[PDB]
């Protein structure tokens, strides 16, 4: 259990001089909170005669199979976990403020797109009084920013070296391969029948 | 600005650079104050080709705001009504909005 100071009040409102009184402001809030922890368990079975007279060790493989399955499932739950008996993730609870990019025209139609305007506008639109904040995005999503072109044909980032490679950690980026990577596999960023499937999660940024 | 015969108010980077250097130098040096969403708007300006106007190809534009003589304050009128919710072609940039101040 823990406390969460909700908001302060306001007391010192300007008033006249020639008056021997004051005005009682309104107080704030405290909002004591709590929280639990969930368990992770399971079982399996082996066969005495089969495991004994076997080609090689099967038991130790299962322990290694259990520790990793817990490892990946925890992180997967920690991100998108539904509240019921699972830690509430920050993806699905929709408590973070979430933006969305407006589509672009092509041949009279209108398809959803992700320009270089967005990622520069997104990372630089974050209250500078919250401190620094790293960003998170899938590798394929970063491969979409690198291979971006202008109208003429030149690259937008790193003009003329066949590779961008910007030393990610310097600029608040941390690649991870758990994110929904809006580019399905590595092909959803097109113009025709490869529309970007409006509504997918591109990247997040937070302290 | 005029887009497809529909006159809409906008704010181009050309106007900003024309506003800053229009100070009566005899007065001295003068800083400029503006909301954070404004500086986010200029940094994300694009030419007719696709390249950015500031910081060509570095994914972010952050100069030192002392040599540039600009001071940010997050509770100014914020021309973008709502957090980054105004500035596109149509249905954007309500007129008569304060953008930035500058003074000795």
């Amino acid at each position: 259990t823990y406390m969460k100071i909700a908001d302060y009040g306001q007391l010192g409102e300007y008033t006249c001089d020639a008056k021997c009184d004051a005005e009682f402001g309104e107080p704030g809030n405290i909002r004591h909170l709590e929280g639990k922890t969930y368990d992770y368990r399971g079982v399996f079975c082996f066969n005495r005669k089969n495991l004994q007279e076997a080609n090689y060790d099967f038991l130790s493989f299962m322990i290694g199979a259990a520790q990793r399955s817990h490892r990946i499932n925890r992180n997967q739950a920690l991100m998108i976990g539904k509240g019921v008996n699972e830690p509430k993730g920050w993806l699905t609870e929709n408590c973070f403020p979430v933006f969305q990019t407006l589509p672009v025209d092509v041949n009279g139609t209108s398809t959803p797109a992700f320009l270089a305007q967005d990622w520069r506008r997104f990372v630089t639109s974050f209250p500078a009084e919250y401190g620094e904040a790293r960003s998170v995005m899938h590798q394929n999503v970063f491969g979409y920013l690198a291979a971006m072109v202008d109208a003429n044909g030149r690259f937008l980032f790193g003009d003329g070296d066949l590779t961008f490679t910007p030393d990610l950690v310097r600029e608040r980026i941390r690649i991870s391969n758990c994110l929904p990577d809006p580019t399905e596999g590595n092909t959803k960023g097109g113009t025709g029948q490869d529309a970007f499937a409006a509504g997918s999660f591109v990247a997040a940024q937070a302290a | 600005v005029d887009v497809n015969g529909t006159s809409t108010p906008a704010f181009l980077a050309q106007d900003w650079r024309r506003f800053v250097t229009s100070f009566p130098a005899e007065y001295g040096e003068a800083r400029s104050v503006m909301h954070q969403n404004v500086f986010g708007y200029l940094a994300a300006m694009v030419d007719a080709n696709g390249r950015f106007l500031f910081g060509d190809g570095d994914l972010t534009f952050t100069p030192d705001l002392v040599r540039e003589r600009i001071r940010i304050s997050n509770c100014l009128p914020d021309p973008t009504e709502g957090n980054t919710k105004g500035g596109t072609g149509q249905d954007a940039f309500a007129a008569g909005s304060f953008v930035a101040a500058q003074a000795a």
Binding site: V104, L115, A147, G153, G185, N186, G190, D194 | A48, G50
Partner: peptide, 28 residues
């Protein structure tokens, strides 16, 4: 209970259809 272990024979005709973002200029 019969456990059906299963395996293909056609190695990998994936043809992922790699796509890169085309020339996108603005939204005006």
């Amino acid at each position: 209970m019969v456990k059906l272990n299963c395996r293909p024979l056609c190695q990998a005709p994936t043809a992922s259809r790699l796509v890169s973002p085309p020339c996108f200029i603005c939204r005006g």
